[PDB]
Amino acid sequence: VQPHVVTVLADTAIRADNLDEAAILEARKNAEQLLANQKSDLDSAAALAALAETAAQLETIRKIKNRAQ
Amino acid sequence: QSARMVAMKAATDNAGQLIKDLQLIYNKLRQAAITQEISEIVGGAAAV
Fold it and tell me: What is the role of this chain (chain A)?
């Protein structure tokens, strides 16, 4: 507290009236973990699959260049 | 996030250069095959 300014450095500062926000903090955690799940899926499912796919049979084609027939 | 963008850009570049490779390969292989069956045809027609 200062004669004009007050700062509140709270660990967990939540706009609320009652100590019952447990119903919304879990919702926040589920949102974060769900978006993490989206990250893990779309990074893996898109790339890692396509990572293997794009590298399928390159040398098979590279050797059959020098075929003059 | 930054490094993922960089890596994916590099993947795009690799794919593009390979794409150029594949068009050239397809072109030459198609030419060679076509010429080959042409040779077969001209050999065959010479018979009868």
Answer: Produces ATP from ADP in the presence of a proton gradient across the membrane.
Please indicate if any CB of chain A lies within 8 Å of the CB of B41: no
Beta strands in chain A (DSSP E): none
Out of A54, A61, A69, whose CB is closest to B32?
Answer: A69
Q: Which of B34, B2, B44, B25 is nearest to A64 (CA)?
A: B25
Technique used to solve these coordinates:
cryo-EM
Taking the C-alpha atoms of residue A7 and residue A15, their distance in angstroms, rounded to an integer, is 15
**Distance, C-alpha A66 to centroid of its chain:** 46
Resolution in A: 4.6
Neighboring chain A residues of B28 at a CB cutoff of 8 Å:
65
Tracing tokens 């490094």 back to the chain, one arrives at B3
- Shortest CA distance to B12 belongs to which of B4, B24, B25? B4
Which is nearest to A62 in space by CA: B47, B21, B15? B21
What's the sign of the alpha-carbon dihedral A19, A20, A22, A25?
Answer: negative
